Structures are given as C-alpha cells and as structure tokens.
Design a protein around this ligand. Structure first.
Ligand SMILES: CC(=O)N[C@@H]1[C@@H](O)[C@H](O)[C@@H](CO)O[C@H]1O
Ligand SMILES: *[C@@H]1O[C@H](CO)[C@@H](O)[C@H](O)[C@H]1NC(C)=O
Lengths: 49, 41
C-alpha cells in the first residue's frame, strides 16, 4: 500500500529499509513525493464448525 | 555547522551528508590541498 509518507527523507536519500533490508519507504523518481510502503494485508483463515 | 571557535575542534557529533558522488574512475595516491593566500616568499 502506497500511503503518503511522513518520513523526512533527506535530499540525498532515496529509500528506507526495514531491519530485514526490506524497503519500507520509496522516493518517486518523477517527483520528490515520499511514499511509505506497507505489506499487503494478509493473515490466517480459520473455519469454525 | 556554526562554530565560534578557531582551534581545538569542538566535541559533540555532526554528520556529513553526501554532497556529490562524482562518478570518476581515476587512481589517487598523492593528495595536496590547494589553499588561497593573503598576499597583500
Ligand atoms: C512533463 C514533465 O516534465 N514531467 C516530469 C516532471 O514532472 C518532473 O519534475 C521531472 C523530473 O524528473 O521529470 C519530468
Ligand atoms: C594508481 O594510478 C596509477 C596512475 O598513475 C596507475 O599506474 C597504478 O596502477 C594505480 N595503482 C592502483 C593500485 O590502482
């Protein structure tokens, strides 16, 4: 999900990585908008019978 | 950074943000600063 980022990316910075080196924020190449990235919603499915 | 001291490099922390990558491919093994002079031997 490409939500509007609150991160204050410095002018030289492009990305932002997680503790596992997964990018959690990105810099749009065409505009200086900072976009933070959250994983697509997931979870287990359990059937109650 | 703003400094009001002329010697004894002040303590504390100050990061150096990258200012230019300069995609160059030379070898450098001898360095020499280029300093102006107050000419006014
Ligand atoms: C029509 C046009 O100029 N589109 C984009 C512009 O919005 C952007 O600021 C620039 C910088 O990459 O690239 C180009
Ligand atoms: C250093 O640069 C010189 C160029 O004068 C070159 O001849 C030499 O091979 C270079 N050395 C290394 C270790 O790259």
């Amino acid at each position: 999900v490409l939500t509007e980022s609150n991160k204050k990316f410095l002018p030289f910075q492009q990305f932002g990585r997680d503790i596992a080196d997964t990018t959690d924020a990105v810099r749009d190449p065409q505009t200086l908008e900072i976009l933070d990235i959250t994983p697509c919603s997931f979870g287990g499915v359990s059937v109650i019978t | 950074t703003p400094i009001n001291l002329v010697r004894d490099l002040p303590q504390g922390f100050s990061a150096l943000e990258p200012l230019v990558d300069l995609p160059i491919g030379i070898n450098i093994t001898r360095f020499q600063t280029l300093l102006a002079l107050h000419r006014s031997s």
